[PDB]
Paper text:
We report biochemical properties and crystal structures of the LD-carboxypeptidases [name] from [name], Bacillus anthracis, and Bacillus subtilis. LD-carboxypeptidases subsequently hydrolyze the L-Lys[A2pm]—D-Ala bond to release the tripeptide.
In SpLdcB, the liganding residues are His153, Asp160, and His207; the equivalents in BsLdcB/BaLdcB are His185/His160, Asp192/Asp167, and His244/His219. To use the nomenclature common to proteases, the unattributed electron density extends as far as the S1′ subsite, the location ordinarily occupied by the scissile amino acid. We have modeled D-Ala because it is the enzymatic product of these enzymes. However, residual electron density adjacent to the zinc ion could not be modeled satisfactorily with any ligand arising from the enzymatic activity, the crystallization media, or purification media; consequently, the remaining electron density has been left unmodeled.
Author numbering: -4 to -1, 56 to 134, 137 to 237
Write the structure that this text describes.
């Protein structure tokens, strides 16, 4: 990511990547509370293949996943988690702030009902998410940069540039040189 500024497109901010334009949603850059594209079909088709490949490799992964969540959905979920604001902020997006609202983010689930955390499966996603155009967004040890505690299961579709990204070991923030961190 060498080196472009973030542009406001109106409903969202984006940064121009090496091959694609990359929507930026985090604690610094919110989405328009209206922006409601639903699930991205191109990302979805890749997720399907990713899922199948994990199942083929022996992993107990569900066909089900958590993808598009609108602003309103995010509101319920964030509120529910307050029940403190402090602790919920560590791991749950405020509405307008979630990559899930872009329709480009997807949480992988085990056939046991839980978000994937099992170690071999987590490593497989670090190793191969990029083969399907995805990155593990909330990397371990990058909580300062991304704004969020690490998530083994949360995939963000970025396309072809995922392999160079994964190779860097960087957060998107660091790779494209935009701000993440805490709400301001
Ligand atoms: Cl691809
Ligand atoms: Zn700023
Ligand atoms: Zn691979
Ligand atoms: Zn997620």
């Amino acid at each position: 990511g060498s080196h472009m500024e973030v542009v406001n497109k109106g409903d969202y901010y984006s940064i121009q990547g090496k091959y694609d334009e990359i929507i930026v949603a985090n604690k610094h850059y919110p989405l328009s509370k209206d922006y409601n594209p639903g699930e991205n079909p191109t990302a979805k088709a890749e997720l399907v293949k990713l899922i199948k490949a994990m199942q083929e490799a022996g992993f107990p992964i569900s066909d089900h996943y958590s993808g598009f969540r609108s602003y309103e959905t995010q509101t319920k979920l964030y509120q529910d988690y307050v029940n403190g604001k402090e602790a919920a902020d560590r791991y749950s997006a405020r509405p307008g702030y979630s990559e899930h609202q872009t329709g480009l983010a997807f949480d992988v689930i085990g056939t046991d009902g839980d978000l994937v955390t099992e170690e071999k499966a987590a490593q497989w996603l670090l190793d191969h998410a990029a083969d399907y155009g995805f990155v593990v967004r909330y990397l371990k040890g990058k909580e300062k940069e991304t704004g969020y505690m690490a998530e083994e299961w949360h995939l963000r579709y970025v396309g072809k540039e995922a392999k160079e990204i994964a190779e860097s070991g960087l957060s998107l923030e660091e790779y494209y040189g935009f701000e993440g961190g805490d709400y301001v």
